[PDB]
Amino acid sequence: HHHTDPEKVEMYIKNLQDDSYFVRRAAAAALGKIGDERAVEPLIKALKDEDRFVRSSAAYALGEIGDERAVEPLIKALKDEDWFVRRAAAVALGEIG
Amino acid sequence: APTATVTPSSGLSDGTVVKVAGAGLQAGTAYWVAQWARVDTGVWAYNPADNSSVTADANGSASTSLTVRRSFEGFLFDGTRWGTVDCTTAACQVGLSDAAGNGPEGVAISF
């Protein structure tokens, strides 16, 4: 629950689709910080990103948000090929219950 | 030997727009321009809010503007929330980095 400019949230949401994994990862981290529920569905799509640090960052953000919608996608990410992504998912699930 | 410039680099305020310049970079390569800080031994946190990807020209140079923060909520490589970074005490710099890891040495910024 943070009073954030909605135009800023839309921007970080568009950034999850950028060419630079750096931009996508940054956007995912920033969305968790903001803690808005509108970022839930676009962040769920990012849990399937080609970059291991984007997927984990999106998983940390989703846990920070605390939305139940992310439960099914986070359980899927718990079976992710990458160790950091699996650790992120485990933590995010614990930040919900 | 790629280099980096930050104009201005000293006496900054929270919200100051700085000119981030890279020279001697690899042509056509993307570089993430971000405010970083060494918050602990081997720990680097980035400001996820103000950052841009600039692509180097044929001459190996790139230029962008950056909004610097005195205080920011810091993140690690994997999207882990570190916590609040205060640049009055923490060693804050601006960095240009390619997908590899390379690029110039970060330019120290003081408030």
Residue numbers in the entry:
A (entry chain C): 8 to 104
B (entry chain A): 2 to 112
Please quote the authors directly.
We have recently reported the design of a new artificial repeat protein family named αRep. This design was based on a specific subgroup of helicoidal repeats commonly found in thermophilic microorganisms. Artificial proteins based on this design were shown to be well-expressed, folded as expected, and extremely stable.
Target NCS-3.24 is a β-sandwich protein. Additionally, this protein is a variant of a bacterial protein, neocarzinostatin (NCS) with a limited set of substitutions previously engineered in one crevice of the protein. The structure of the NCS-3.24/bNCS-16 complex was determined to 2.6 Å resolution with two copies of the heterodimer in the asymmetric unit. The structure of bNCS-16 is very similar to those of A3 and bA3-2 (rmsd of 0.4–0.7 Å over 60–95 Cα atoms). In the structure of the NCS-3.24/bNCS-16 complex, the C-cap of the αRep protein (residues to 105 to 139) is not visible in the electron density due to partial degradation (residues 125 to 139, as observed for bA3-2) and to high flexibility of the remaining region (residues 105 to 124). The NCS-3.24/bNCS-16 complex involves an interface area of 720 Å2, with 17 residues from NCS-3.24 contacting 17 residues from bNCS-16. Ten out of 17 interacting residues from bNCS-16 locate within the N-cap of the protein while 5 and 2 interacting residues are from internal αRep repeats 1 and 2, respectively. Among the eighteen residues from NCS-3.24 involved in bNCS-16 binding, six correspond to “variable” NCS positions (Trp33, Trp37, Tyr47, Asn52, Phe78 and Ser98), and are therefore different from the homologous positions in the wild-type NCS, explaining why NCS-wt is not recognized by bNCS-16. In addition, the side chain of Trp33 from NCS-3.24, which runs parallel to the THS1 steroid rings and hence plays a predominant role in its binding rearranges by 90° so as to interact with helix 2 from the N-cap and is no longer available for the stabilization of THS1. ITC titration of bNCS-16 with NCS-3.24 yielded Kd and n values of 1.4±0.3 μM and 1.4±0.1 respectively.
